[PDB]
Write a protein that binds this DNA or RNA. Sequence first.
RNA 1: UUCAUCUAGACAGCCGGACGGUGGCCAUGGAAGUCGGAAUCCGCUAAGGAGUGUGUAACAACUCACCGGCCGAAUGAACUA
RNA 2: GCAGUCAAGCGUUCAUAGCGACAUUGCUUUUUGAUUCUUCGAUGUCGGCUCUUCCUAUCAUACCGAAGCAGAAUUCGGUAA
Lengths: 68, 126, 136, 65, 191, 234, 63, 199, 50
Amino acid sequence: STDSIVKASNWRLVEVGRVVLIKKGQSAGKLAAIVEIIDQKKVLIDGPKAGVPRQAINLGQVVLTPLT
Amino acid sequence: KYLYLRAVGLSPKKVGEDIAKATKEFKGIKVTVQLKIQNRQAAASVVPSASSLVITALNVKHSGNIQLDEIIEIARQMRDKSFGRTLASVTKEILGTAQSVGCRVDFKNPHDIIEGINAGEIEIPE
Amino acid sequence: SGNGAQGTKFRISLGLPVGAIMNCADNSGARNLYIIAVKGSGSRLNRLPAASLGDMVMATVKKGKPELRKKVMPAIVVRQAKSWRRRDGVFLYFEDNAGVIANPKGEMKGSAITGPVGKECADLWPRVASNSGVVV
Amino acid sequence: PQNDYIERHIKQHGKRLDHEERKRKREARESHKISERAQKLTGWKGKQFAKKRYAEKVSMRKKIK
Amino acid sequence: MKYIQTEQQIEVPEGVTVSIKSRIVKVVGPRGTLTKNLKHIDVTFTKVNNQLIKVAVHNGGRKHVAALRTVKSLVDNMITGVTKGYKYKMRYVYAHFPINVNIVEKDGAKFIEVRNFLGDKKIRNVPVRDGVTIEFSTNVKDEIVLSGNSVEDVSQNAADLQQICRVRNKDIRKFLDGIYVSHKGFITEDL
Amino acid sequence: MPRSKRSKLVTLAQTDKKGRENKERIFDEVREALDTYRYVWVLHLDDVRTPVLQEIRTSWAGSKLIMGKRKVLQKALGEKREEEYKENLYQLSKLCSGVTGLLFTDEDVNTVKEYFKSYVRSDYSRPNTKAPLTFTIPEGIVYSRGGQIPAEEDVPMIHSLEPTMRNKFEIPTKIKAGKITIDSPYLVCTEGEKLDVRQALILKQFGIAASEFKVKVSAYYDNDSSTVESTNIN
Amino acid sequence: ILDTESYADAFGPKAQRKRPRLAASNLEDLVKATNEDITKYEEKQVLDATLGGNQEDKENGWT
Amino acid sequence: EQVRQHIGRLPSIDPNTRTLLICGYPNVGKSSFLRCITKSDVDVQPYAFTTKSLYVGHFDYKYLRFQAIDTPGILDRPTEEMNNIEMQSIYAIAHLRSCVLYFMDLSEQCGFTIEAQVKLFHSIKPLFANKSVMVVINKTDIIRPEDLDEERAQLLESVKEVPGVEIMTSSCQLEENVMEVRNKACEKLLASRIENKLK
Amino acid sequence: MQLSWKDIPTVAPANDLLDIVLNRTQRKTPTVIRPGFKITRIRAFYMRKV
RNA sequence: UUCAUCUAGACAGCCGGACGGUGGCCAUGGAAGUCGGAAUCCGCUAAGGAGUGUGUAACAACUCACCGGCCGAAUGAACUA
RNA sequence: GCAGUCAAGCGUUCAUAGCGACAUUGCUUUUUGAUUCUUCGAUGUCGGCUCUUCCUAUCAUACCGAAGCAGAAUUCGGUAA
């Protein structure tokens, strides 16, 4: 009846297998899977079913989506 | 119980005129002495100490020329209350004390008798 | 107030600016005193330090006994020709303005005072009240 | 009072009950206060603070060496 | 360098229930309840377990990670106050004038009233903070006990007595008088 | 390392850090002693006053007692068979359990075991052990022994010890004319108490050595027989 | 004198001057020297009392 | 700076007012002559120099103000080998026009045999060639002059040979006796001062 | 005063006294002149410092 | 950047040891590592200064430097921008 | 100020080719508060009466901190116009 309750914000995580949404560039509006983490701001994404070439891209260029 | 003092060369007025006997075998050399009180009367005794025995082997200053026959003797008076496997160790404490005092043993500085023993140049009865 | 003064002193109209000759009321041998300074006076720019009844001044004996002149001793004003107010309302004045020689702790050099002494000064200085045959 | 009456007072009555801890805390804070002075003392007081710190550091170094 | 993720662990005991929503922490246990507003620190909590809570900062600088251990320790002090409870004991000492420390209700509130401090005719009023209990030990002469669920309140009110009796314009090597914290402890002692 | 860091406080003392070579020397001395002497006991001396250790070390001369880091001794004897030094020796490095000493010797096993059964000297009632007594500090002027010799036989406690009595010992002490004084009797511990740190620091402060010390000896390695006998005299 | 004994040796926390460096031979010469000093000092006070009453004017506080 | 700090603490000894020094060994155990005959704090515990400077107290006798001075103590050495601490006592004795009170402890406690204290008295006799001197035998509540040895009493009667010197018994634990000692010391002092003044 | 000497002023160390008096000069005297001033003003400035 | 330390256990903490000649010599009211002047060695050691400071009238006690137990993995110093 | 000294550092290639912070030493009227009670070319005309404001580098008043600061007083320092 008396347990600890902590409201955890359920942040999308930059993780291998997180799929992103490239909002600008030649790949606008195409999905892409995060393949490796490069650093805090840049990752390597890959979107082969949507026509996205494997590339290293800033995290400010894509939008994390809830799908993993 | 026992009360120890060094300031020689509880009923204060009585023991002073009773411990003179134990001292003054020492010609004004400062020596540690003890007291063995039974109920209210003490008995005087002179405790074997390195510095006090080194002096009798000779303000003021000490130059000594003590011969090593007596340094081993002074060490031999202290074996029971020292941490020495050999009399070489105990005579090495005595040579350290002598170097502290300022004398010389067998006409040279007491410290070279330390490495004299260490080099085997000096040997100690045991 | 000053040294040896008993309690507070209320305002009375200032009668004696610096440079004012005032009579010597006591019998110390001085015949008149010359105010060179006034104790307790504030520092207003062009305002001369002024003295009133009951106030301690610094005065030189200008005329009188030669054993007392050429010296600057404290004095306590005991009379005044400037009409001042008494709280039981009456404005009063004396016919002359006079003082007595006092050491800085309040004691009278003289052994008596001649002529009247204002009660505002007798009350404030016990050694004045104790040496004054006539008060008010 | 006539002769070393403050040692006599410390012997006979001690020091204030927080003296050890308040002194220790002031000593511990002195390291922060040195930085604060060196970053906030302005002008001539700051110049003197810097110079005396340099002199104290060189004396500490010479003491070591 | 920005640490990718730095964490601290707030261990909750058996009887304590803590509620944290939007960095407002409520801690409830046997001795009552405490609440603290942590909205000035950008810090993230997580219930890893009913007996453990993880507090973490993502992508933090050297000044921002300095606030994790503070937050963890503040929640820990809450937990210890709500289980063990904090008990500050102050001893007032005097040389000639006996300090008279009483508890008086002034205007619906509670006050420590210090009298005769070095013969002062002034009466020194120290308000009692809420949740702090001021008790006078009888077993020891001249000692005050402060207790409460919050270390912050108890320690602040104790220091308020410590400072209300500061000796002014006297040589504090000779004038030893005042109210001093003697011992900071827990109410229980031993669990 | 980036700024705002604790300043290392150094002082100007004589003695220096020993370093790696001292551990190498202990390692090699243990090795040579293993080659020379026959019986190697492991001695537990977790909290031992140095005069006691030196008396034990000089209550025999033809043997050797080696201390040092526990890990370096377990290394010298060897952690396991793959790294040991003599046949079946790793059963000793598994038996080094704290402040450990190695007693290389040729004395007969019966002599050593009876000596370490029967040797005892008093020590301070070190913390975290069952209290061997109960002393209540009397009310009034506290003396050096706290009443364990009578008041006329003892001297008053130094006034300079009162801050420790009041802060580190939590004893409610006063200074009355330069003498530490408690208004009511204060008990420090009871017989059977699992001592805390401050109880055992109080007991040491009054020179209360009611407890006793003896060497806790576990198994010994017989060199030539190449086996270890799990003696255990706690 | 500062070459033999310094200010720090003369007085202070690190003072070493423990005996008077010019102690008299015996007590009685010290006593007669003291009597002469006291007689000289008190005669000096007497003769200077012939110059003053300005000290007594300080009792009456004028200048 | 060190001189100023120290010189500002020194007592206010007036050489000319009625004074009486407390020589010998008055401070034994809990007792001390200066704590008992006047308001003043003087350290006591039996070691050779428990006070390193002159301590002053004051009292009133017959509506007159007296000062009493505790001297740090003297050893029986020659003058060429006495230190500053006991030069203080010797200078205090030699300068201050006082009534010297020389204390001996017939008990064991001071650390001196009786003849040692008497030989010290015979050493500092010439300082007394001008004052009035009194001998005060203390701690008689813990010693027995009835069983005082004949050679001890033969030396004690031998100190009265010195002109102007008279002994007394005393005990600091009875205030009446210390007030008696102080009273007669004061009376001798007023006698000498009055003989001077009416001359 | 002839029987006591409590009232001696605090006598600072040499470098402390140096700081005290030099800083009193730098505070209790004006500290700005320009080389374009009359040489009389420059002189008066520095004579006042001294 | 350079150098150094580190599962032969690093840095920080508690806890323990911190000894024996020895209260070394001289000094003096006292001076025992710690008011001072000069020595500054030996033994036993895992380590422990003829003592880093608080302390005592002297001692006592505490302390560090130095070892060791617990813990477990990186840390310290000087420099440069 | 001049002339030295030392050397943290610098140069570097050679640390003796040289620079060089801090620190320090010699010079300035006699070691016992006596004198040294002691004056020596401003090529300058600015200065007072009234009256206002600003500066802080604070004399006082306010509050603090450090001192042998017992008290009283004082000294040094901080915020402060």
